[PDB]
Ligand binder design. Structure first.
Ligand code: NA
Ligand code: NA
Lengths: 310, 310, 310, 310, 310
C-alpha cells in the first residue's frame, strides 16, 4: 500500500441550511505520496496546472481520485495542481467547493450544538493499495469567527478509520475495506436573535394574557383572551420554516404549546366562572384569586424546565 | 446475450419532495459481465479510473451504457471506475446521484406509506444482446433510519422484467424488448409532527367553537364563532404547500372541512335561535340543549371515520 | 432532399408550470434516413453509442442536428445512439428532456383545456436538403393517466409543415424554407381540487354574508359584514400565485369580484337603512325584505353566467 | 478592417423579471463576412455544423467571437453552424438564449414603458480589425403580440456605435475602440390586471372609509375606520414583491399613501369631534358636514394627479 | 519572480444579496507579463482566442492561472483571449462573472455603508515565482450610478499584499507566501425606500397608539391599543427577510421594540387606571395627564438615539 499524507485547509464555511441539514465548505486539499524518482527540468520541482494533468495521466502517472462521501450533489472543483519532485514524490493540490451533509439534532434549538463533518475516501483503492497516513487540518480563517448564527469553538478533530463495503465483496473477495478521513468542526449556535425576536414578543403576549384576568367585565376578558390565543396559535409554523418538519418539539415549540395551554385554560376558567353565575349577580372570589398564582405557575413550570432540561 | 450481474449500493436517500413526488438517491452501481481473456500488467486486475475509460472504448472495449428510467433531469455521475481481469471479466463501477420519481398516493396523508423506486435499463441493447442475471441491493446505511419524516421498513425488493417498446419496432422488427431492474424500498411516514403541530391547535380551536354555546349573550356567541370559523377557513391551503394540488381530500383536509361544517352549523343554529325570539324575551331550551350533543356528534363522526377508514 | 422518418416516444410529462406556461417532456426521438451502403462487422447492424458518434462524424458521416423550437433553455440530452445498417440506412436514437413552452388561455380556469406542443426542426438544412416524411408518436405511458391536475384525452396529433425564414434570405436567396414537425397532446384540467378547496369555503363565506341580514341589530349587521368583505378581499391574489398576472378575469376571479359587490352592496344597503332612521325609532320593511331576494339575485347571476359562459 | 454584416432573428421574449430588471431573449444570430476564395465539395456551399467548426479553427480559419454585453450569466448557446462559399465568404449562424439586462424606470408603474436592449460586440477585435457594416433585425414572431403583461409596439431600432475602452489602452496604445450593435425593442405594459385586481378592491376600501362618516355612534365610526386603515397599511409591500425595493413611489404606492392619509385624517377628525363633546351631549355639525367634501377632496387630488402626472 | 501587471475593468455590479452577504461582479481582467521574444505572423501581435490557448499551453507556453479568493461557487468565465507580442510580452485577457462575498455590518441598517471586495491570487505560484507589480482598476460604468438600493461613492481602492499559507509549509518549506490583490469599492445604501415604506406607516401606527389615550371609555382604549400592539408585533420578522437572522438589532428593529414597549406600557397604564377605580366612579387625572408626556418621552428617546448613535 502507498502512504498518502493529506492536508486540508478550510477557507470558509457558509450557507448552513438547517432545513436540509447541509452546509457549504470552501478550501484546498493537498495529498502527498511518494513514487519512483523522475527527471524534471533542472533540479527544481515541476508544477503541472489544470488541463495538463491529463497528459501525464495518459502518459502513465498514478494519480488517485479522492472523493468526498457526505456531499449532496457533486463538489465543484476549481483549479487543480500537480507537483512533481526529482526525489520522486507527487503532490496533488486542488480546490474544492461542495455542499456537505451531516445529521443534526434540534432538541435544544436556540442553544444548540452541532458539528460540520468532512468525510474523504478513495473511490477505487482499498487499504491494501492506498493508506492514509495522517491528516493535518489548518483551520485558522474560521478558527474563532461567527458564521451568520454559528460560533466555531475549539480546533478541528481528525480521525482515520477503515470502512468495509459489502457491495464490493463479490468483485473483491477478501479486500473490500477502504481507508477514510473524518474532519469534525464543532459549532455552537448564537441564541441572541431568537431572544430579542421571538421570545421577547411572545413573552409580552403571554404577559398580556396574564393581565386580562384583572378586567372587571366578561366580554373584555373573553374577546381579548381569544385574540391573544389565536395570535399564539398563529406562531405554530415558526420553527418549520427555520428547521424542518421535525418529529420532536424544541424549546420554542414547547413555549408555544405552553402558551396554547395557558390561554386556553384561562378561557375555560373565565367561561366556567361566568357559568357559575346562575342568577347573574353572584361573584366568585376563590376562582378569581388566581391572578397571581397562574403566572406564578407558568414561571414555576418554566424554571423547572430550564433547570431539568439544561 | 451477455449476462450482466448488477449490484446497487444505496448510500443515502434525501430530498423527498412530496410536492413534485421526487426524491434523491445517492450510491454506487456495480455491473459485472464476462468477455474474452486479456493480458494485464502482471497477474493482477487492472483498475481504469475516470477520463481513462474512453481510451479503452476507442480501442474497442464493449462497455454498455445503463440508464435510469424514472429520473427527472439527468443523474449527476461522479467518479467512475473500470476493472479488468486476466480471466476475462469486466466490472464497471460508478457513483450516481439523481432525482428519481415515483407515483405517490396521499389518501391517508399523516399515516401514509409510499415506496422509493429505482428503475435501471440498458439504453440500446435488447434482451437478445444484454440480459440482467440478478441484482443484489445492499441497503444498510438506510436500513432502519429516519429520513426527515420517513421511516425505512424492511429490506429492498428486487425484480427483473422485460419491457417491450413499440417505437423501436420499425428499426428492430421482432427484437424490441428490453430487460429491466426495479428496486423498491418501502417508506412509512412519521405522523408525530402533524400530531403536535396541526391537529393539536385545530382540535383546541374546534373545542373553543364547542364551548361558545355556553355563553349567555348572542353577540358573544356570534362574533367569536365567526372569528373561529374564519380561523379554520384560513387553514385551507395547508396541505397544498406540503403536498401538491391533489384532486382528493386527505385526513387533514377532511378534518378542516369538518371544522367548516361544525362552526357554520353552530352559526346557523344560533342565528335561527335568535330569529325564533319573536318578542325578544322567549328563550328556547331544546334547541340549546345541544351543548353536549354537538361535540358528541363530532366525536362520533370522528371515531366512525377512524374505524372505517383505517 | 433526404427523407427523414421520425418516431417520437413520450416517456412522461411532468412539471406543468402554468405561471410560466411551460412543461417538461421526457422521452426518446428516433430519426431514420437512408444513405450509401457500407460494410459492418459481420452482416449485423452496428450500434455506435454516445461519445463515439463524433469519431464517425469526423470520418465523414452525415448526421443532421434536429433541434426543438419551443423550448426554454436547452434540452438536456442523455444517452444517444447511432445504428448503421449494411443496406445503407442510418438511425439516430437519442433521449431528450427539455422544458417546452406553449401559449395557454385561462378564461375557464377551473374547467380549462390546453395542449402540450412539441416542435421539431432541422437547424441548418432546408426542405431542399432534408425532408420529414412522416412522424408516428407512441404515447402510451401517458395515454389515459392523470398528471397532477391534468387529464390526457385522445391520441397525439401530428402535422408536417414547411416554415419560411426571412433572416436566411440573404444567405440563401430562394431556398430558406424549413420542414417542421408539430406534435400536439390535448390536456383537460381536473377541477376537483378547486371545487373542494376554494369554491366550498368562499361559498360558505358568501352564505354567511347572506345570513347577516337576519340579525336584529345594526352593529352586528355591520362589523360582521365588514369582516366577511375584508376576508373576501384577502382572496384577491389567489389566482396570481397559480397562474400569472393575466390581464383577464377567470371564473374564480369573477366569483371573488361578485363577492366584493355582494357584500359591499349589503354594507351600503344596511348603512342606508340606518340613515333612513331619522328619529331612531322608524323601522323599514320593504328595504329589509330582500333577505331572500338578494341571495336569489346572486344565484340568478350565477346560473346565467354558468349557462351563457359554458 | 473586415466588414461583418449581422442579422439577428428574435424567436421569442420571455421571463421578464422586473424585480431584477432582466429578461430572456431567444433567437438566432447570423454573421457574414468575406475572406479568401476556397475549394468546396463540388460548386456548392459547405455546411459545417457544431463540434466540427473547431477542426476548421485548428486548421487556420478566422472565426471571430461575438459576445453579448448586457447579459447576466452567460448566454446558453445551442446548435451553431458555419457556412463556407466557394466565392470566399464565411457565414456564422448560431442560436443564443441568454438573460439580458436593462435599466428600467418605474415612475408610472401600471402604465409603464420600457424597452428590451440587446448589445453585441466583438471580444478581442477593435474597429481597425473588425467593423460592423449593418444589422437587419427580423422581429415578426413578437411583432404585435402580448408577452404576459407587455405589449410590443413598433419595429426594432438598430444602431451601430464605436465604444472606447480605457483598460485596453496600455495593451493597445492608440487602437482600443470597439464597434457595437444595439437593438432596442419598445414594450408597453398592460395595466388591466392591476385595474381589476388592486385598484378595484382598494377603491372600495377607501369608499367604505368614506361611508363610515354616516354612522351615528362613535365606536362604530372608530373601530371600523381603524380596521380599514390597518387593511390599507397591510398593502405596503405590494409593489416590492412585483418590482424591487425602489427609492421612489409609483402610482400604486402614492394611492396607498393617500389611503393612509385619508383614513388617518378621518380617525383624527372623529377623535377631535368626540373630544369637543365636553359635556357628552353637544353635537357638532360643521365639522361633520365633511361627509361629501372629504371624498370630493380625495377625488380632486386624484384628478389633479391624473392630469398633471400623465 | 515574474512581474505580472493586472488591469481589472468592472462592467457592472448587480445582485447584491444582503441575506447571504454576496454580490455579483461582471467585467474583464487583463494580466500582462514579459517572457522570451518570439516570432509572430508578420510584425504584428498575434491574438489567440478561446479554445485555442490550450494548443499553446500544450506546446509549452507559461500561462499562470489567477483565481478569485472570495467567491461563492466558481466564477463563470466567458470568452478569453491571449495576445502574443514579437518583443516577448504575453497578455491574458478574460471575462469573469462570479458571486463574490464580503462581511457586512448591519448596525445602522437604513443608513448603512459596506464595500464590495474583489480578491485575486495565483493558485500555484508564490511570490518567489510570480509577483503582482501594480493594479489599475477602471471603474467608470459604475462610478457614480445607483445599483438598486446602493450608491457607489469614490474611486476603487487597490492594495497588493503577500499572504502566507501554513498548509503549504510541508510541501514548500520556506516559500509558502502568495501575492494578493484586493480591490475595494465603497457603497452607501439609499434609505429612501424604508423611509416612505416602513417608517412612515409604523410612525402613524405609533401616533394612533398615542392618540388612543384621548378616548373617554375603557373598552375603546383597550381593544384598539391591543390591535395596534399586535399590528406592531406582526412586524417582527421584517428585517429577517431583507437581511439575515442577525444577532444584533438595527435602527428598524429598535424602533419596532420601542413600539412594543410603548403600546405595552400604555396597556399596563390603562389597566392600572381601571383597577384603581375601586368603586367604579372615581376618576384619576394625574395618571391620565400623560397624553402629552408619553409621546414627548417617545420623541425624547428617539432624538437621543439619533444624536448618540449617529
Ligand atoms: Na369588537
Ligand atoms: Na383580525
Amino acid at each position: 500500500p502507498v502512504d498518502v499524507s493529506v492536508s486540508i485547509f478550510i477557507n470558509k464555511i457558509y450557507g448552513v441550511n438547517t432545513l436540509e441539514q447541509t452546509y457549504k465548505v470552501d478550501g484546498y486539499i493537498v495529498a502527498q505520496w511518494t513514487g519512483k524518482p523522475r527527471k524534471t527540468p533542472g533540479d527544481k520541482p515541476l508544477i503541472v496546472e489544470n488541463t495538463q494533468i491529463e497528459r501525464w495521466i495518459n502518459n502513465g502517472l498514478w494519480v488517485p481520485a479522492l472523493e468526498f462521501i457526505n456531499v449532496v450533489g457533486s463538489p465543484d472543483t476549481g483549479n487543480k495542481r500537480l507537483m512533481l519532485f526529482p526525489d520522486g514524490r507527487v503532490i496533488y493540490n486542488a480546490r474544492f467547493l461542495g455542499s456537505f451533509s451531516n445529521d443534526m439534532d434540534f432538541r435544544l434549538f436556540p442553544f444548540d450544538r452541532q458539528q460540520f463533518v468532512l468525510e474523504l475516501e478513495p473511490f477505487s483503492y482499498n487499504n491494501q493499495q492506498l493508506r492514509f497516513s495522517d491528516i493535518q487540518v489548518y483551520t485558522e480563517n474560521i478558527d474563532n469567527e461567527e458564521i451568520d448564527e454559528w460560533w466555531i469553538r475549539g480546533k478541528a478533530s481528525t480521525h482515520i478509520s477503515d470502512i468495509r463495503y459489502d457491495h464490493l465483496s463479490s468483485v473483491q473477495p477478501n479486500q473490500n475495506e477502504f481507508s477514510r478521513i473524518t474532519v469534525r468542526i464543532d459549532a455552537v449556535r448564537n441564541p441572541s436573535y431568537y431572544l430579542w425576536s421571538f421570545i421577547l414578543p411572545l413573552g409580552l403576549i403571554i404577559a398580556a394574557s396574564w393581565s386580562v384576568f384583572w378586567l372587571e367585565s366578561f366580554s373584555e376578558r373573553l374577546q381579548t383572551s381569544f385574540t391573544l390565543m389565536l395570535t399564539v396559535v398563529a406562531y405554530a409554523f415558526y420553527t418549520s420554516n427555520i428547521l424542518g418538519r421535525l418529529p420532536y418539539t424544541t424549546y420554542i415549540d414547547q413555549m408555544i404549546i405552553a402558551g396554547y395551554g395557558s390561554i386556553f385554560a384561562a378561557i375555560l376558567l373565565i367561561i366556567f366562572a361566568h357559568h357559575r353565575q346562575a342568577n347573574g349577580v353572584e361573584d366568585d372570589l376563590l376562582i378569581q384569586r388566581s391572578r397571581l398564582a397562574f403566572p406564578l405557575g407558568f414561571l414555576a413550570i418554566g424554571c423547572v424546565l430550564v433547570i431539568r432540561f439544561f
